[PDB]
Design a protein around this ligand. Sequence first.
Ligand SMILES: [Mg+2]
Ligand SMILES: [Zn+2]
Ligand SMILES: [Zn+2]
Ligand SMILES: [Zn+2]
Lengths: 52, 49, 96, 34, 240, 49, 46, 48, 67, 427, 258, 115
Amino acid sequence: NELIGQTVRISQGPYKGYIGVVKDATESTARVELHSTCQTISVDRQRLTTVG
Amino acid sequence: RDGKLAKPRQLHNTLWGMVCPAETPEGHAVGLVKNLALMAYISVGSQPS
Amino acid sequence: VVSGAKGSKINISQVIAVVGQQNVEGKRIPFGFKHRTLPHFIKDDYGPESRGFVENSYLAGLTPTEFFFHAMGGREGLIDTAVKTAETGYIQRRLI
Amino acid sequence: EITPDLWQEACWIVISSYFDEKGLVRQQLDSFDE
Amino acid sequence: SLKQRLKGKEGRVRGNLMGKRVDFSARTVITPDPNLSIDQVGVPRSIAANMTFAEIVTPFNIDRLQELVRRGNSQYPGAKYIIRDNGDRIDLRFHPKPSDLHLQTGYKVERHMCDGDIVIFNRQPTLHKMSMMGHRVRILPWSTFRLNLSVTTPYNADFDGDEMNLHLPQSLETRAEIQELAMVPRMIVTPQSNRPVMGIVQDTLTAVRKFTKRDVFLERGEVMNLLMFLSTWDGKVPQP
Amino acid sequence: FIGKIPIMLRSTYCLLNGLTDRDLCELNECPLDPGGYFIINGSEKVLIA
Amino acid sequence: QPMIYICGECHTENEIKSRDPIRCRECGYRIMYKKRTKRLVVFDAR
Amino acid sequence: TVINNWLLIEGHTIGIGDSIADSKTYQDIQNTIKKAKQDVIEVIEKAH
Amino acid sequence: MIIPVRCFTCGKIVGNKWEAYLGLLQAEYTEGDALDALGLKRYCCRRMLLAHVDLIEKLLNYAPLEK
Amino acid sequence: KRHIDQLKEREYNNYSWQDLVASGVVEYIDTLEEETVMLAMTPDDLQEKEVAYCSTYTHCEIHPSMILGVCASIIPFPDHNQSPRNTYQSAMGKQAMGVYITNFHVRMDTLAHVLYYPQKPLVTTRSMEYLRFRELPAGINSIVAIASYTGYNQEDSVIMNRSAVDRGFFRSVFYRSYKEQESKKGFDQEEVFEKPTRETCQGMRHAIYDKLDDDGLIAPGVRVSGDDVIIGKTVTLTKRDCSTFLRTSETGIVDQVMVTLNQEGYKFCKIRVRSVRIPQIGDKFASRHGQKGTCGIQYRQEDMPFTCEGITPDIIINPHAIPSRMTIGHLIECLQGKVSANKGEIGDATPFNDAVNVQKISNLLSDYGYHLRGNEVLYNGFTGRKITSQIFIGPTYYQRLKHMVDDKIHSRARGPIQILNRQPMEG
Amino acid sequence: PYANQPTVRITELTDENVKFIIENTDLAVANSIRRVFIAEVPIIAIDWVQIDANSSVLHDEFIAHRLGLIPLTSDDIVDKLQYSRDCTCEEFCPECSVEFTLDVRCNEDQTRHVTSRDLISNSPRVIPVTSRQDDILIVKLRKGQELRLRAYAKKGFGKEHAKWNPTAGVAFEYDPDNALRHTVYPKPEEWPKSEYSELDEDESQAPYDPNGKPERFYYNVESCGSLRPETIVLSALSGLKKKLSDLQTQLSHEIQSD
Amino acid sequence: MNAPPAFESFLLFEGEKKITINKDTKVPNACLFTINKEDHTLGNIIKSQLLKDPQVLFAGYKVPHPLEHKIIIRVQTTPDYSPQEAFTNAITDLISELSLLEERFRVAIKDKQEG
RNA sequence: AAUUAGCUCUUGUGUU
Ligand SMILES: [Mg+2]
Ligand SMILES: [Zn+2]
Ligand SMILES: [Zn+2]
Ligand SMILES: [Zn+2]
């Protein structure tokens, strides 16, 4: 999968502007470990934006 | 350790100004591990001649 | 205290009135040195404060001699716990 | 002259002098050096 | 030597047969919570999502189990494994093909622990029978076990660094056994000394002593505020 | 040559003997470090009396 | 291709190819520190 | 629940003021301790 | 390590008063007088400056890890 | 007075402790010789003319509070507590979070904890002047109120101010260092630091190797979490993956990476990873009088009770912790903290002083507009109503013990197995 | 069954605090106004930090935390910006954020004091509190140490984080003379008179009033410097009113369907 | 690790109703309002205003759990007066209260700034 | 999908 291992930026929602790393993703959502917090969240791919 | 004896673990009277009467482990080695007082010193030894 | 949530009458007595006599092995403070508990006393003194009676309260603070005697008294509680736990665990195991 | 009741200052000056002359790990350093 | 392998403690008989290390166990620090019933324990989300419980598929609950399998192992109220009746197990952490996600009547689902699950709650110095009572799970945000205060006495707990252990029964028979035998309310009175082992402790006791004094009077507003917290209230305000 | 003996830190034969606080800071050594311990395999070892 | 390392003594960035002795061009030092990553880092002010 | 929510109004604490006497009970305690010391001294001298 | 920006209890800015506090102290002012001259009324703010140790000054003595 | 004067202007002249010894004023007495001497506790009190007790003293104590040790000499008013409480404080003083050394940025130690804002205690003993505690403190002065607010601190637990925590209160950072070197495992076995590739490794998991760079090592500043490879080490049999991994549930940021050669010339790297710890509930806090406790709940500033002004407690502890534990020294320290903060000078809590007592401190406090016993009228945070009982409140020094809950949370469901007896592993 | 008529009287007004008195209102309204003062007043603070090169003695999270606590002068931009959660845009636009930049390099041997004036805002109407006593110290740098970063500041209130708390101290108080006996003094002679006490030096507390209710609440709201205290009070009142209006709309929608 | 995000204190998620009404069955003319993502700030004033109404027999509020952001308000009124209109009248009275207080504060601030 | 034995330190039980 292309999205796995990509440094992503959340574009919408309460988590807007937080960057992270995608660990596991599916055809609908993805799992992102946050650079600013010590937790992993689940976010829809519609609110995601790959950076670099 | 694990010895039924309790006399060496107690706080002797002679431990005044030599060993802290309050700092000791609370585990199985209570009273067997101690700390020097603030002003206590330990002799290095000398020739008796 | 009256509600029984915590504490007892002797706690209030020690905090306000007087700590009381310190005891080791059920007896007063023994002659660790030669016929005196501490070098600050004279030989063969059987007075109250010499043998480990604390005349001050926890509010008023303890003088150094009675402070050390109180430390001696309090050590035995931890020692008794550390030995009694291991002594009684074996009894309980044998019973079960 | 004697020091009547002006004794806390001296009592702690002597201790400060002691701890300046000898540190807190004096016994170990002395033992190893000897 | 072979004698040493099984001689005493840490040997086979005492360290591996009469007592073993078990699965579906958790251990965390305990903290107070006066908003839980005496038979409830508050567990963190991570522990609940880490240890699972097996449930049989039936027509009564096939839709809920199918939805949980769809949710997967990422979202909390989901599943972790799906076990076919022929013994084969399919892992839900590898996002398999949707054909495997289909489940029928004879299958089993290893769903995450949810609210209402029965657990055994233990403190290691197990001295009497009331040190391994049973509780009902409630999910709470932060990462500590939270239990009612009145039940801190049988456990001899202190809320000052104490850690307790949670065991999750994995079968319906075991769950029914724990529910009908070792639940907290069923163990209020001990057979040791035919008296309760649970009372009112700490500041609740002091406040109930100060509250039932002869000279305690309340206005209507505080009376309604207090009555809001009665679970068994019948809705009638008593005549002052 | 006979062998190597470890040296208690801040001793007479330690390189950090009598140096000023400026030198210790230049050597990335804390002037508040009391010393009195050995360094074996890069680990700080202390001897209980 | 090369990896940038920083000497602990002379603080001079030097380039070392893979499978080479770890030593500084001057001052003969043996301890080298890796440089900061070039990917973006984002911290919430919370 | 009910008692804890009423405690928010009533409140409960403990401080230095709860460990102080009326300065008249202190005199009684001091006199009692002095009498005890004198009695122990009398017993000691009678033993001597 | 370094002076906090805001008081822990109330949140008043106290991070811009350390240098002024040191200047007042070196101007032969008692600590209490300096604190009340800096407009610190509540003792929650007073303890922030009165009981603060500046470890960054000792940290700056060490040579930089990279230059 | 001559010796005291000459010793006061020391480090200007060359008068020192050794010169005091040579003058025959002090003497080293050992415990065997102590048997045959006569000590006076204090000069003035035990050597004047009163009812003749001894009148034949030979030696006098320098200061009685020198019988304590290093850890026990940081307790304020230790002669007002119960002895087991002093023992517990002596034990827990070695677990308190704080700056353990100034040069903690160069030491690649394992399990390093360090607090952001350590504070010099508002009330101190004279003894801790020589322990360098004023230069490397461990703890913060917090406005502690002793009250039963909601019931989330009923049994040796505390209620923390969430807004205070947001402002960096008791926030800390925890370090951890991983060491690893490449070694000559054998003629055909040889480890090497190199990024594994999906075309040359037989034994390999789904672990992602793009987080670390081509040197086989992670880069500083890179966010890492559990099940992430930091050092890519592969040993030839094509190769077997022997790469190291971050400990499960760590979630830190790579602080620094150091590469060098060991004693035998092989490559060897030590990598330090930091992690910010917030005082969440379940963390362990202890006073200086053996009053340990765990955070039960965190209320924001509006929820906590407040005084007439906008002062709210940072930590609320239960009253029931006091009466059974005889920590009257805790109350006295709290009372003197108010005087020290209002007056503007660090108070003195030398164990045996006789110049400081509750009455004088209360009289001093009554001059600043507060109740002489330290009580204040608190307003309920939720309903804004006055509390019928005035609450004891004041600044007290607290320490943050190293026992955080996130280092103790653990769970298992069919994990690894042992080799001899097929039973779940240990740890 | 209808609302009462409050009265207001400001006794002091400065650039840092406002002292006033409110009459003819219930205690619940007063306390809720206090809580809205503390928690729910929108304000601008830094909430996004990206560090390019930090060679100081403090790590990155420490610098970010110190930056987040710096107050920003946000007096009229607060109601003009939108919450970043509600702005329909990708990446922070100037309608929902304010950009700051920092770049400090210490070359001279003397220590460098990275302070708040080193923050360079791209919006003249939002700056740290240095408009017109040193600055909020951020970092101390030695020679050869540099710090380059860029931050985005957004809108929020204190309920989310305490960095969005506008007030420094709210000195709420009612009934200075204990007429209602809401608090009981075991020894009334041992307590100092309140600041707002209209009581003679002879007695300690007022005589009991069996039929009385809390009135005449005394406020002393002291701001941290971002919002003017009067603006703080007005914004808190507007926010509480808006929350009540939203609740009313939701209730009307729920009822019209039930 | 298990820390909830801060915005969960006040943000509603998908499928979450701001306010829910349930008709109590124990006594007549009793209803329960379940407000989501609120705290004592609204509950206290709503309860006080409902108590001011002489046609309300019972008005109380509670927060079931401090870690769960929701409040429950129980309102019981005399027959011929449903609790819904009592609640909305209380809200209207609060709105009037706040608006009048705000404009009076504006006037007084003007007066203070102009001597 | 990568081992073990030994040692040391520490945590909770120290209540009346
Ligand atoms: Mg305990
Ligand atoms: Zn070099
Ligand atoms: Zn403050
Ligand atoms: Zn936008």
